[PDB]
Amino acid sequence: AIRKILYLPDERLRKIAKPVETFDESLQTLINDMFDTMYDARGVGLAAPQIGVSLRLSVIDIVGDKKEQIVIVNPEIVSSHGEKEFEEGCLSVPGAYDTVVRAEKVTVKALDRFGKPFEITGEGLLAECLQHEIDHMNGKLFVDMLSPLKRMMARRKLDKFKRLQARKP
Ligand SMILES: [Cl-]
Ligand code: NI
């Protein structure tokens, strides 16, 4: 159920994910496994490329209490407003946190986990998460937006995290 999260520089994180074409039982299992993986990592969003599945699919739970689980399949940004700084991290760049600029408000259209079209508008953390998720589906990671010095620092923190995990029994 709980799948391993991939870390930079895994090239599977850099692929352009393919649209979901088939809503079958395997897709529901994938969605359920992604939720389990996201909750285990104590995250609020997870994109399929982050577990090695090259599909334009993400799961979201902003509050964390499973009361409003969001699944976005084949999302497209229909509109956005404003631009502001966010202090941001990423489950696929563990240990590295920095400031990036994204839209302040975004409206996304997608299919839900059963294929029904819906639209969602977000501000704050939800807006940040939606844009971060779509970036993952396009092979983009937040460190790509940083200065060379800050990207180098992020990689150093990531490498320290990896070394620490490898020392565990
Ligand atoms: Cl993430
Ligand atoms: Ni991420």
HEC secondary structure over the chain: CCCCCCCCCCHHHHCCCECCCCCCHHHHHHHHHHHHHHHHCCCCEEEHHHHCCCECEEEECCCCCCCCCEEEEEEEEEEEECCEEEEECCCCCCCCCEEEEECCEEEEEEECCCCCEEEEEEEHHHHHHHHHHHHHHCCCCHHHHCCHHHHHHHHHHHHHHHHHHHHCC
- Separation between Cα atoms, residue 80 and residue 123, nearest integer Å: 10
In the reported structure, the alpha carbon of residue 46 is separated from the centroid of ligand 1 by a whole-number distance in angstroms of 5
Instruction: Compute the distance between CA of residue 158 and CA of residue 160 in angstroms, rounded to an integer.
Output: 5
Q: Whose CA is closest to 75, among 109, 44, 103?
A: 109
Cis peptide bond prior to 94, omega within 30° of 0:
no
Q: Which residues fall within 8 angstroms of residue 41, CB to CB, at 6 or more apart?
A: 5, 91
Nearest ligand, measured from the Cα of 135: 2
| Method of structure determination | X-ray
CA of 156 to the centre of ligand 1 (A): 18
What is the number of alpha carbons within 13 Å of residue 121 lying toward its C-beta? 4
Q: Tokens for 141?
A: 């990671």
How far apart, in whole angstroms, are the C-alpha atoms of residue 23 and residue 114? 7
- Measured CA to CA, the distance from residue 90 to residue 88 in angstroms comes to 7
Please name which ligand lies nearest the alpha carbon of 13. Answer: 2
Distances (CA, A) of 88 to 3, 25, 93, 131, 135: 23, 34, 11, 12, 13
Distance 90 CA to ligand 1 centre (A): 4
Tokens for 166, please give them.
């490898």
Given the structure tokens 């979201």, which residue do they identify? Answer: 60
The annotation status of 129 as a binding-site residue, yes or no, is no
- Count CA within 13 A, CB hemisphere, residue 130: 28
Q: What's the CATH class of domain 1-169? A: alpha beta
Q: Is 132 annotated as a binding residue?
A: yes
For residue 143, the ligand closest to its alpha carbon is: 2
Q: Distance, CA 92 to ligand 2 centroid (Å)?
A: 6
Q: Does the annotation mark 133 as catalytic?
A: yes
Nearest to 31 by CA among 115, 88, 100, 90: 115
